[PDB]
């Protein structure tokens, strides 16, 4: 809901978006950070409280 228009962005732009989800509790971020290690990206946004 904070990032819906970011989801719309490819609809008129050349942007490519990589959406990830954080399962509840702070212990689930480890697999996501490891896959961030495996998949090389440097442009990350954290949508969280």
């Amino acid at each position: 809901i904070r990032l819906q228009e970011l989801i719309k962005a490819p609809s008129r732009y050349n942007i490519k978006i990589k959406i990830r989800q954080l399962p509840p509790a702070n212990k689930d971020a480890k697999p996501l950070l490891k896959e961030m290690k495996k998949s090389k990206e440097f442009y990350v946004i954290f949508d969280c409280s």
């Binding site: 809901i1 819906q4 989801i7 509840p24």
Partner: protein
């Protein structure tokens, strides 16, 4: 039908027969990965769709 789950309180009185979003979502994952289409798009009605 579908009701937004209480993500802050726990209630045992939730009797919803509406199918889970997770099951249908993994079903469509299954069909698309079976069909091995590496070039796909999706369209959705609103942010409520996602």
């Amino acid at each position: 039908r579908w009701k937004h789950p209480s993500v802050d309180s726990r209630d045992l009185f939730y009797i919803n027969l509406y199918p889970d979003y997770a099951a249908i979502s993994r079903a469509v994952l299954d069909l698309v990965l079976y069909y091995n289409w590496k070039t796909v798009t999706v369209v959705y009605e609103d942010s409520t769709g996602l």
